[PDB]
Write a protein that binds this ligand. Structure first.
Ligand SMILES: CN(CCc1ccccn1)C(=O)c1ccccc1
Ligand SMILES: [Zn+2]
Ligand SMILES: [Zn+2]
Ligand SMILES: [Zn+2]
Length: 459
């Protein structure tokens, strides 16, 4: 069981207002045929236009909510809405475009999908709350056939051109007019009671209904993300490398070690309470502090309430020493904390829009993160940049310009002049730091944290 069988039944109740008289007994095979597509008994990598929930979860980066509303159906204009916020009007002759024929609407669809998806995925997955018009509109902008490769590269083809009779991926499709071998999934097949808005609004207050096709397209994809990543979590699913994943994860490990060591030394805490991942390792192994771990998986729905993490009777005294919350999202951090909190608002190829202000951060695994909330950090302050090192000043083994910086906390800078080794290490650490910040991570620390206390650790 790899793909969705075309002989699987498809519930047609949601389709009968736009398509009256539709048979209750229906397969994907018959539905695809009714949509104007012929699969010709083809065993060439595209067995079904529709896919399973498990296949959709593996391809979450390709998700594009799609809805079609009858503006007035052969004789009436259609409003095509996409979870990108785009609304196109197709005439049969929050962005709102005026009525145009399909031959130009399809050019716009290919440009919009290519620009949104070229740095996310090798395909498109149309996420539907199917009522009929969206399925019957597909023949006007979609072509299907055997799996193909791009004419300019080795990537799979996602677009087709009638002008040149050629195929292209999302990177090489400028001037292409047809979406080729798209995938799709009808959320209404998952077993829901009531309409789209009533199921969406149960879990999300961020997406409203301005009564346009893009609002429904947005709500549909949000509801699909809630079902697949919020109420259901699967951290075994691996996702391909599409950007700076490796550099970001390595930077996160460097910054954590740097900041936690410096806190321990500067304030000499006797105990550290490490709250978060149950598979966490001591980030400063050569530490003399009493290191105590507390297990909490990444919260994907709402941030943990500090009252439930800490209270109901462990050291018991979380007020003793320091608390380390490294990607452990809580509602209000205690004053004696060191915190790394992912900012869901960040724009990047790793961060996809999520449910109720949250975001879906996809880096090796998929992690739905509750909305970033500035009030969580009232007891703390922003952690400023600094580099600390007690390692020997020794080059060993890239050209040089001398480093001058008030934030290079080293014996050499204390002594008046930064050595080559510590300048190279400072510059590498500043690059790792900037990578992690730009990726969306934000750092917070207890108000008494002062790097001035690190200079006396050189005596
Ligand atoms: C300084 N602290 C805090 C606990 C402490 C406080 C006072 C004396 C000893 N240990 C460390 O755990 C530590 C970190 C990095 C290197 C070496 C020791
Ligand atoms: Zn290509
Ligand atoms: Zn929503
Ligand atoms: Zn040095």
């Amino acid at each position: 069981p790899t793909h969705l069988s075309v002989d699987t039944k498809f519930k047609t109740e949601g389709l009968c207002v736009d398509i009256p008289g539709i048979p209750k007994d229906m397969t994907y095979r018959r539905l695809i045929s009714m949509m104007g597509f012929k699969m010709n008994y083809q065993v060439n990598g595209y067995p079904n236009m529709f896919i399973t929930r498990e296949e959709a979860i593996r391809h979450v980066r390709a998700w594009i909510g799609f809805d079609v509303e009858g503006c007035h159906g052969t004789n009436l204009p259609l409003q095509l809405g996409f979870s990108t916020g785009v609304n196109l009007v197709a005439v049969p002759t929050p962005l709102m475009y005026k009525g145009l024929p399909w031959n130009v609407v399809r050019i716009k669809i290919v440009q919009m999908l290519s620009d949104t998806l070229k740095n996310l995925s090798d395909r498109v997955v149309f996420v539907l709350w199917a009522h009929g018009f969206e399925l019957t509109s597909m023949k006007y902008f979609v072509k299907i056939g055997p799996e193909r490769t791009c004419c300019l590269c080795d990537r799979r083809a996602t677009c087709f051109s009638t002008a040149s009779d050629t195929y292209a991926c999302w990177h090489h499709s400028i001037g292409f007019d047809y979406v080729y071998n798209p995938f799709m999934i009808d959320v209404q097949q998952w077993g829901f009671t009531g309409n789209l808005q009533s199921n969406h609004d149960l879990y999300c207050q961020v997406h409203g209904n301005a009564h346009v096709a893009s609002c429904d397209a947005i709500m549909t994809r949000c509801l699909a993300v809630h079902e697949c990543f919020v109420k259901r979590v699967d951290w075994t699913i691996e996702y391909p490398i599409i950007g700076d994943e490796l550099k970001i994860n390595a930077a996160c490990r460097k910054v954590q070690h740097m900041v936690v060591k410096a806190a321990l030394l500067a304030d000499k805490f006797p105990v550290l309470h490490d709250i978060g991942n149950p598979k966490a390792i001591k980030c400063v192994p050569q530490a003399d502090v009493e290191w105590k771990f507390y297990d909490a998986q990444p919260c994907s729905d709402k941030a943990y309430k500090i009252e439930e993490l800490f209270y109901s009777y462990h050291s018991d005294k979380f007020t003793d020493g320091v608390c380390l919350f490294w990607n452990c999202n809580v509602d209000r951090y205690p004053a004696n904390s060191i915190v790394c909190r992912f900012d869901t608002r960040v724009l990047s190829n790793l961060n996809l829009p999520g449910c109720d202000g949250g975001s879906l951060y996809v880096n090796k695994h998929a992690f739905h993160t509750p909305a970033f909330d500035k009030s969580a950090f009232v007891n703390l302050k922003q952690l400023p940049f600094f580099y600390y090192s007690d390692s020997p000043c020794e080059s060993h083994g890239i050209d040089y310009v001398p480093l001058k910086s008030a934030t290079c906390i080293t014996r050499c800078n204390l002594g008046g002049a930064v050595c080559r080794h510590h300048a190279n290490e400072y510059r590498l650490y500043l690059d790792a730091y900037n990578m992690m910040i730009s990726a969306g991570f934000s750092l917070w620390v207890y108000k008494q944290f002062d790097t001035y206390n690190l200079w006396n650790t050189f005596t």
